[PDB]
Symmetry: D2
Subunit: 362 residues, 4 copies
């Protein structure tokens, strides 16, 4: 999550004083508001940037005089993010988008005066808008529901956000939380900032726990759906083999090595393809080929050589009808679908092969 | 599990003809019964051995005239296992055990006439007896209960074992299943042998599924008991570091590499200790040290260098107060308590670090 | 080289007593002579074998009454090598060879009565005879010259071999040195055996020194014939690259890693293909591909990806016109022509890349 | 080598026109002369820098009004190197040195008016002067002799340098070659620059060839000085070992793996410490420990474990009396002294172990 501190004050010294305490509290972004860009020049964003190079500075240009030139004036003064309005012409948005690409600067677009905010949000994602800014309305939070469920890019929210209302906007999927007077008008703006970051870590702990249990739920399904042909086909091939070669691609290769390390303890004549001591593949040897897609070129080339040498091939893959699957004598189908398809495949194979070891040890 | 075919026939030519069909069905051991060692000589054991060199031949010498001379004659004729009685004197048991030790031959001892079957099995385990043979009694299976719960060595069972009664003795923990007339006196002895092996694989499928869910249940516990101080300490150290070095011992090292591969995709300046491209540890770098015991010498030595260079150390360990834990600035405790202590730590850390990656990608 | 002790004594108890002292001195083979296989039976070969299982026992059957029956009796009594005559019929030679093949036993054939010793040895090599035995003649050693220069299999020598005449037969290429009374009829047969082994190591020291200088002489030739276009092409590509990827096959890969370790110390953005931390190949990156043949499939496949990504490829190979060479933008040709073709390329490249490092450090 | 183009013209447009052609010819450094820094301001170095960011710009401040302030004025305008006089006060030199450290800028010091140029050069190296500038005098080149042989930092030379005199100053060890009118007053300044760089590559080819032969000369000395105790001690230990473990540190570890790969082809039971399949070190195993210094902590710890397990240790080291040497049963002393001591040790071990392989193959 990202905490953006809106410095809506007209006092330049009061604004920098607040940002310094908020920065110690853990705030990520600092917004130079429109009341600060009219009195002070564009150097207002440069004063904040040269003082806080570790933070991203957001230039609030949510006024109608803003064109592609004012957006470039922000980037040259050190603005990392520039905010504009959605009611502006599409021509000015793409012109601001091209200027942003020349400087590596993000673009935020507000929907404060948009009739159909939902429809407008989708086309903004098409041109390359980085963030969408919506307001809470403190039917409050109704807008945050639909715009978030409509687009994939991060959505920023603002409007009466305090330690009381911030947990709500997080539950609805807001990425950027813009808070103003709740920090700027407090006795300890740094202390209030830490409580907001503590709320962020309440969500982070839920994310990691949910990520862990989402993987373990998938692995329980793999275990419940294992077939006798697959398990026995692998075990009988391992026992009847002269040498055992294991070959996996990328992270699958680390899983293969972790399995080989255990097989060595059971006095199997096992080797890892690609390491120093790997001997020549001969007749009667077994190749355990691990590839989630079943199309990895190096894994397929190794399986083809093993068949030509008069050996057996066991393919661990998610696609039994893949090129690797059609070569194998035994196909162990591990499904791959929080976590990507590859991560589920690698971790499921990891614990499946540990189940294989437990079986051999009994 | 082990399938032992009892050849109680007195015809030697019929015994080898039937043993050949049972061997094709997947039988592991072949027993030359006492009615075969009295009509035929000790050459009955040598004829079976030279015919089935890949099979283990069991010489049934379960009579009371058996001494060290008859036991030594079996090993010299090619018997891999010799079965004797438990009611014999302890002197003859160690004399048969010492004779067996001279040939690398196992010794099976039956408890058919033992008063207290539980006690006798345990003291047999003390002298070094390899296997204990008990009978079903077809209160049937009561003995199989207590002998299994009393010793750690494999327990052999025999007595009215067919396709209906074999599943029960497997459920009670018998390792060696001795089947006679159910195979030897059947119209298709090879088909019955395959069906008995199919019964073995019904238990194997239960073992591997139970092995997998035992690991995932422990990881769910790890997720529920993760601490915010530890998780945030690791993440904040990772974000605030110049270079990130990851170093694990053995199988833990493969887990560390799997985490490093993902961190590289997230544009971290990450390296794996021990690989070719690893640069020098400087001030502001972070060492993530992974060691279940927290006492691995190489991992501890790397943590000491990292501290002397003015760097941070995060220890992922099962022992927070270990030598590695006491050096670390942040300790991520992966709790402990079918699978060994090392396997649970490695698999829990693997899925925990995948939860960390899921958090960083949000 | 092999030291064979001829036990031509008729006393069996004296033969084993002397063979025990020769074995402690380091003798490899023990020959039970014909005067021992006629007075004593074929059990002379079994008594020696069960006494020296780590030694190879040679059964001297060099008489003309020897047929397939006597040769088979030696293998069944534990003879590892059987010596017969070259003047026998070819039918009995292949019959002894086929009998030997059934036991995994070698066959030695003497040429004591052969008309044309050169021709007979070569046709013996065609049938699969393992060793050729010739006699010194103490024009002595003339036969040892021609038989050695005629066949590829080891040549055994015998005839007046003591500490003065053994160095000469070694210089002429004899592999098996058969010594009799110089050991068996001496005051210290164990000491004489150690002195004969010391003679073997005088030749070994010459072999290893000659092996090393053969490699360094080839590398001096590589240095003298290096081309400015190749060397500068590699250096200029290295300096002008964003990332440098190094990829070698097998032992060439270890050489590539050794070069990568040094380049990292020179502040190059260098990575090794196949290791954990290797990132994605982008535009402006360089692939240094090392392959002696220029046909290694994985190396060729990596060069093709590097070209499709808009990168440069430098191929270090022995074949400029190979598949890898034709893909490369720069080809560094490491020339070819005791050491195999692979060893010369790997060691020449290793020292060439160390010359490159010395240049860069200046 | 470095080619520095002195732009001594007073015309700013003529100076930038010359530097653009010289840059295409391969010139490394561009010097903004004093006749350019008096007419134009310090922006003269900024105009060259913003036009040639790929080149290092040298600010010629060899006048007496130069203090620490003028040196800082050059760095803020983009000067990568600043040149001053040696006849200035030592106070101004260290003040310029401290300013250079704040900006990462090099300092060049001329000896045009120094009485004893040799003596003055040494103390300049003590304070941290990066380069020493001397003049040819076209007894010309006499100054270049003594100043180069007195200091270790790079020495820059200037004065009548043309395609005729440049080969001479290179032979005397000049690092930076400053050429003016020979390029600036030619019909093709880019073409003349390429001929100077071609002269540089005539020296580079000599450097790499000399580096290669310096290594091979050292290896021939190692071969000539090998001892029977070392070679036989290693070979007898390898043959009499159950398992063979190889463990080297850093680049020595790659040499160890290259040797292990060859030993595997000879059917040795050989393993590499640190890889996946490495089994447990048991009684009767051999550890080949490779460490140039004989003090590498991980190598010493592995040798100590091997001795406690009842195994043998062979140490390949340059220091027989090191900690590793005192542990070993056999010490193979490889000397380590163009190339560092480690490079000579690693490459000598590399070809020695290839001599060992050739010996075993005979
Ligand atoms: Mg705002
Ligand atoms: Mg029975
Ligand atoms: Mg002879
Ligand atoms: Mg000058």
């Amino acid at each position: 999550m990202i905490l953006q501190v809106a410095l809506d004050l007209t006092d330049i010294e009061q604004a920098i004083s607040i940002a310094e305490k908020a920065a110690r509290g853990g705030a990520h972004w600092l917004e130079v508001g429109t009341p600060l860009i009219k009195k002070e020049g564009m150097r207002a964003v440069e004063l904040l940037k040269r003082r806080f190079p570790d933070r991203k500075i957001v230039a609030d240009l949510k006024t109608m005089d803003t064109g592609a030139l004012e957006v470039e004036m922000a980037a040259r003064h050190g603005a990392d993010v520039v905010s504009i309005l959605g009611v502006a012409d599409d021509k000015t948005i793409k012109d601001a988008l091209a200027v942003a690409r020349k400087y590596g600067v993000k673009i935020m677009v507000d929907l404060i005066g948009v009739k159909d905010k939902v429809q407008r949000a989708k086309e903004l994602e098409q041109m390359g808008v980085h963030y969408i800014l919506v307001h809470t309305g403190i039917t409050p939070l109704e807008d945050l529901e639909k715009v978030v469920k409509a687009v994939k890019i991060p959505v920023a929210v603002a409007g009466g956000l305090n330690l009381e209302t911030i947990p709500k906007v997080i539950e609805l999927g807001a990425t950027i939380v813009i808070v103003g007077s709740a920090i700027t008008k407090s006795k300890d703006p740094e202390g209030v900032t830490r409580k907001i970051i503590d709320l962020f870590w309440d969500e982070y702990m839920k994310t990691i726990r949910k990520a862990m249990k989402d993987i373990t739920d998938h692995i329980n399904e793999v275990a419940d759906k294992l077939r006798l042909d697959e398990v026995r086909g692998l075990v009988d091939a391992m026992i009847g083999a002269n040498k055992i070669f294991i070959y996996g691609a990328g992270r699958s290769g680390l899983v293969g090595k972790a399995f080989a390390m255990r097989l060595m303890h059971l006095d199997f004549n096992v080797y890892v393809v690609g390491e120093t001591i790997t001997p020549a593949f001969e007749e009667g040897d077994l190749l355990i080929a691990i590839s989630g897609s079943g199309e990895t070129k190096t894994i397929v080339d190794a399986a083809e050589i093993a068949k030509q040498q008069g050996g057996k091939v066991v393919a661990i893959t998610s696609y039994k009808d893949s090129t690797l699957g059609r070569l194998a004598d035994v196909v162990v189908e591990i499904p791959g679908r929080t976590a990507p398809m590859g991560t589920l495949f690698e971790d499921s194979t990891m614990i499946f092969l540990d189940g294989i070891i437990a079986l051999l040890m009994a």
